[PDB]
Design a protein around this ligand. Structure first.
Ligand SMILES: NC(=O)c1ccc[n+]([C@@H]2O[C@H](COP(=O)([O-])OP(=O)(O)OC[C@H]3O[C@@H](n4cnc5c(N)ncnc54)[C@H](O)[C@@H]3O)[C@@H](O)[C@H]2O)c1
Ligand SMILES: NC(=O)c1ccc[n+]([C@@H]2O[C@H](COP(=O)([O-])OP(=O)(O)OC[C@H]3O[C@@H](n4cnc5c(N)ncnc54)[C@H](O)[C@@H]3O)[C@@H](O)[C@H]2O)c1
Ligand SMILES: Cc1c(C2CN(C(=O)/C=C/c3cnc4[nH]c(=O)ccc4c3)C2)oc2ccccc12
Ligand SMILES: Cc1c(C2CN(C(=O)/C=C/c3cnc4[nH]c(=O)ccc4c3)C2)oc2ccccc12
Lengths: 258, 244
């Protein structure tokens, strides 16, 4: 048996085969995890349904985290099979295309601010509220974050005015939920390129440097991420709640090279 | 007067107890030329009254909720300070509702939006609206708390906005640096507003004067080498643990 044997985990944000959350799933299922899957809208149903086919899970349900009701009804349907389950993965994030443009001050708008903080940050706790009662004792939550949340990176702009908002969200959550036997963590992924660079400019060159400058001299993979995520979602990490773990190959710990 | 020859806009004065009041008090003390904002017909009275005390009387109606109010105040200010050297962001809100008991239970969609909207977005928003009036060696400032960095019971969604705000500060500095603008936050300790003393290194809380003279400094050219920085004016409470 692999660990997270015995566990039921819901995994959000699975757009593709190179979708990171595809990695989180892989690692988990590879370790005998029974999963469940949400898709955003009818456009992604497909499709993700098939990926869940691959990973041996029936459960396939719409969930547009913009709407409290959609999250409610999602979980309600999920309860039909999983009266209880053991945590979910939050690999959701968005900010209107225009938002991640050039100069931050220029580009950022109240609405772009609103959406980015709603979808990449609030949504995570939104889900936690709706399924709080459905969490077994010893279940864990995870969400995915970036170094933007910690530092100013061009054309990331409002994204971590969000990821920072989301980074604290982790903490307060982990704080409110421990008493009842729940751990909230987050992985600071390096890059790692998936459907997200669909608003990120300058990307082709962006990876090489920072590959020559990462302590390990390669970018981390959806496997590398999937792998720390599965551990952070398994009982092996029983003593880790409220921590923002970096999986960037050590990128954020170097400086001035070369 | 190490702040002399400078024109700074202070927001968020509402009482003698206000942080912004000590900031202004401290700022005039160092010969700064000051301007103020009110947010209510309520507040207009007191703010105007303190204006006279501090020798200035640029006093304008500004509610950071409305992108429109914002630009009109800046427009009105440009008439008297066509250009100036920065502003203090002593604002924060959560319709709370929110800062009572369990975090997850308390928090709501709207509540998350409103906190973030006023406590964090406002700060950049103003910055857009006066980009153009900012003289080189300008300084923006905002008042934060430790709840950004650590989960304080009952601070709840505010923590997340300050987190977002401090993020915001780092970005703003980075965007505005090529034009001589510095941005910083004071992570102030406990003291309008809304027993660390035993655990605090200096064995007392910071005071409006403490925070005052730091703002002053951060907004003067004496703090020339500091930008995008969250200075903990909390008496070293940030950095200690388990003091019996
Ligand atoms: N290098 C990277 O790509 C990188 C690095 C660090 C963190 N992250 C984070 O990891 C997560 C996954 O992004 P990714 O780029 O790896 O894969 P991705 O870009 O395919 O993930 C995007 C997901 O956003 C979701 N989404 C957007 N709006 C939604 C809504 N209203 N309702 C429901 N779902 C919605 C979709 O379900 C989609 O699967 C994001 O939170 C992202 O910020 C990515
Ligand atoms: N004293 C403390 O408890 C403490 C400690 C650390 C940090 N802070 C921070 O300092 C800042 C100021 O708080 P304070 O303690 O000085 O008193 P306060 O919170 O009463 O003053 C805040 C001011 O915000 C203004 N305001 C509210 N909504 C507004 C809007 N929509 N548009 C424009 N202005 C608006 C009001 O005029 C008010 O005087 C806040 O950002 C707070 O988070 C306060
Ligand atoms: C790597 C890397 C990233 C990672 C982190 N991931 C994201 O947060 C993506 C966010 C995002 C946010 N909003 C978006 N909106 C869109 O319309 C299309 C794609 C889109 C992506 C991609 O962001 C960077 C910004 C600057 C430089 C490098 C990176
Ligand atoms: C409080 C509060 C705020 C802002 C002002 N900020 C603060 O000054 C916060 C101070 C604070 C916040 N949390 C704290 N937590 C503690 O446990 C003990 C000290 C402590 C102090 C939060 O905006 C509001 C809007 C409506 C209603 C209440 C508030």
């Amino acid at each position: 048996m692999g660990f997270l044997s015995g566990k039921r985990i819901l995994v959000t944000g699975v757009a593709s085969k190179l979708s990171i959350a595809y990695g989180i799933a892989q690692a988990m299922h590879r370790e005998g995890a029974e999963l469940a899957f949400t898709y955003q809208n009818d456009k992604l149903k497909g499709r993700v349904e098939e990926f869940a086919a691959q990973l041996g899970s029936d459960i396939v349900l719409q969930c547009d985290v913009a709407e409290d009701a959609s999250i409610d009804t999602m979980f309600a349907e999920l309860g039909k099979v999983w009266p209880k389950f053991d945590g979910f993965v939050h690999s959701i994030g968005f900010a209107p295309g225009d938002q991640l443009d050039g100069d931050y001050v220029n580009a950022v708008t109240r609405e772009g601010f609103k959406i980015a903080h709603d979808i990449s940050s609030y949504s995570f706790v939104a889900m936690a509220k709706a399924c709080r009662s459905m969490l077994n004792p010893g279940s864990a939550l995870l969400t995915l974050s970036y170094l933007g949340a910690e530092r100013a990176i061009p054309n990331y702009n409002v994204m971590g005015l969000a990821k920072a908002s989301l980074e604290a969200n982790v903490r307060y959550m982990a704080n409110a939920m421990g008493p009842e036997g729940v751990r909230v963590n987050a992985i600071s992924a390096g890059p790692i390129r998936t459907l997200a660079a669909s608003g990120i400019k300058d990307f082709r060159k962006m990876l090489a440097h920072c590959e020559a400058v990462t302590p390990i001299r390669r970018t981390v993979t959806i496997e590398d991420v999937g792998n720390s995520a599965a551990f952070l979602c398994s009982d092996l990490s029983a003593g880790i709640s409220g921590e923002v773990v970096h999986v960037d190959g050590g990128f954020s710990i170097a400086a001035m090279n070369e």
